[PDB]
Amino acid sequence: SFEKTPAIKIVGNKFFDSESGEQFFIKGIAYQLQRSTSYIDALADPKICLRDIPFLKMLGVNTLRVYAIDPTKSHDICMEALSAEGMYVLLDLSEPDISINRENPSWDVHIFERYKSVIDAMSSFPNLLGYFAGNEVTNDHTNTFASPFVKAAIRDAKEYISHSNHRKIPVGYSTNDDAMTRDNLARYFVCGDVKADFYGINMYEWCGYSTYGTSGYRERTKEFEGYPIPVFFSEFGCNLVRPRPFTEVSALYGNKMSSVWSGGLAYMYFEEENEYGVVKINDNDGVDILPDFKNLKKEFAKADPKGITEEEYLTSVECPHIAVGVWEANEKLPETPDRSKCACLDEILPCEIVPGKYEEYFSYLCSKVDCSDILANGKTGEYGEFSDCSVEQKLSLQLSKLYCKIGANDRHCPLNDKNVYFNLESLQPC
């Protein structure tokens, strides 16, 4: 049974419970373990999730943000246990080792396959609230050209979900709070022909015993009035002053903010020595409640957002202009990564490379052949024909071009490295 968690849907700039029609406000907490797979999936481990859910119930949350799941594992036990306490999940599609790289952005078959795997693993659950297609990818004025890759990812995740048999779980974005870029980012993700379904801000402006006016919350709220998609704090909980009073929660669910924002999620459940936890897991794997816990609990308990209903509510935007060093996200987006096309390279290329060396060998190979066909430029909106293939496929293409330009036809690939091999399938006459 998922009785206690009806699916949430979006109408205009609000979330609604699909059965009752009541507006849905997120009262959440970030729930993610990390090592000190590379990531840890607490929702794949019943002994972990079933330990913590009673503590999450005490806090009074209705939503978790989860940053990374292992899509090869079952999540039925934990998702049903969450559902039984009225709890929903916001889930990032990426993981630290398979994310859009803000320093060298790409939207390719490897990242898209990750996104699809997560979608296929998690979309059966009615309490899956939504997916994030990225988290703080662009984070300042030096990497705004990453954002077209994120928008392509939003488009392609939505299309994959649309073409699947799954419920149409919304796909949004989570952004940081950099003064120079925030307004342009907010506009960019709702501009043109591809839009985020919702928009989370990682919002740390309220520290200690601040106020609506002095924190910045009043000006954030004014700039987001009339924003066309649901907006919430995908993270909050500045820890400058401890124990965190979480008095921002009273402002967030109050009358000035509840008509604009769809709530938010505290960062975070586990204490992991960034001093952001509300509990701490001891050496015996037991839960020790920290002094922040009771303040978050008290504030969420008091919070009573006056929303609207779906029926009464029911009665393109220009992309920011390009300016060098300020905003360099082209409106033109990279193409949908094509697994078949890129898989053809594995079949037909004479010289292949199995997955420091990428830098050296792209630099070597791209001095000898023209690598434009694998370059992707989010500033200029120029995306090479094979720029959507995996890093190894791209490198293999360039190696093979060099092999064909030499024209020896002797099965000797022109790069001495153990990962290089002649592909015998290339001989069988994409």
Ligand X SMILES: OC[C@H]1O[C@@H](O[C@@H]2[C@@H](O)[C@H](O[C@@H]3[C@@H](O)[C@H](n4cc(CCC[n+]5cccc6ccccc65)nn4)O[C@H](CO)[C@H]3O)O[C@H](CO)[C@H]2O)[C@H](O)[C@@H](O)[C@@H]1O
Partners of residue 233 on adjacent β-strands = 201, 264
- According to CB under 6 A, which residues from 113 to 152 bind ligand X? 134-135, 137
Please state, in angstroms and as integers, the Cα–Cα distance from residue 237 to each residue in 133, 141, 198, 262, following that order.
23, 25, 21, 16
| Residue 70 within binding range of ligand X, rule CB under 6 A | no
Is 92 annotated to bind a ligand? Reply is no
| Phi, psi values for residue 380, rounded to 5° | -90, -15
User: Closer to ligand X at the Cβ: 101 or 372?
Assistant: 101
The distance of closest approach from Cβ of residue 105 to ligand X in the complex, given in angstroms and rounded to an integer, is 8
- According to CB under 6 A, which residues from 199 to 218 bind ligand X? 204
Is 364 annotated to bind a ligand? Reply is no
Binding mask 154-193 for ligand X (x = CB under 6 A): ----------------------x-----------------
Cβ-contact 29, 56 below 8 angstroms: yes
User: Closer to ligand X at the Cβ: 10 or 133?
Assistant: 133
- According to CB under 6 A, which residues from 234 to 293 bind ligand X? 235, 238, 267
Total residues interacting with ligand X, rule: CB under 6 A: 21
Cβ-based neighbour number of residue 351 at 10 Å: 24
**Residue 136 bears catalytic tag:** yes
Is 182 annotated to bind a ligand? Reply is yes
| Active-site annotation holder among 136, 248, 328, 352 | 136
**Residue 272 bears catalytic tag:** no
| Phi, psi values for residue 133, rounded to 5° | -85, -5
**Per-residue tokens: 337:** 């990564």
DSSP letters, 104-160, are S----HHHHHHHHHHHHHHTT-TTEEEEEEEESSS-STT-GGGHHHHHHHHHHHHHH
| Residue 106 within binding range of ligand X, rule CB under 6 A | no
Cβ-contact 179, 153 below 8 angstroms: no
One of 5, 13, 32, 83 touching ligand X (CB under 6 A): 32
Half-sphere exposure for 290 (CA within 13 Å, toward CB): 20
| Residue 34 within binding range of ligand X, rule CB under 6 A | yes
DSSP letters, 305-334, are ----BHHHHT--BPPPPPBTTTB---SS-P
The distance of closest approach from Cβ of residue 391 to ligand X in the complex, given in angstroms and rounded to an integer, is 13
User: Closer to ligand X at the Cβ: 13 or 139?
Assistant: 139
User: Closer to ligand X at the Cβ: 231 or 268?
Assistant: 268
State how far the Cα of 396 lies from the Cα of 379, in Å rounded to an integer. 26
The distance of closest approach from Cβ of residue 70 to ligand X in the complex, given in angstroms and rounded to an integer, is 12
Is 267 annotated to bind a ligand? Reply is yes
Q: How far apart are the first and last CA of the chain?
A: 47
Is 22 annotated to bind a ligand? Reply is no
| Active-site annotation holder among 113, 235, 275, 328 | 235
- According to CB under 6 A, which residues from 312 to 331 bind ligand X? none
State how far the Cα of 268 lies from the Cα of 270, in Å rounded to an integer. 6
State how far the Cα of 355 lies from the Cα of 358, in Å rounded to an integer. 9
Cβ-contact 319, 192 below 8 angstroms: yes
Is 1 annotated to bind a ligand? Reply is no
Is 177 annotated to bind a ligand? Reply is yes
Binding residue positions: 67, 94-102, 135-136, 177, 182, 267
Active site residues: 136, 235
Binding residue positions for (1,3-beta-D-glucosyl)n: 67, 94-102, 135-136, 177, 182, 267
Q: Which residues would be at the binding site for ligand X (CB under 6 A)? A: 30, 32, 34, 67-68, 92, 94-96, 99-102, 134-135, 137, 176, 204, 235, 238, 267
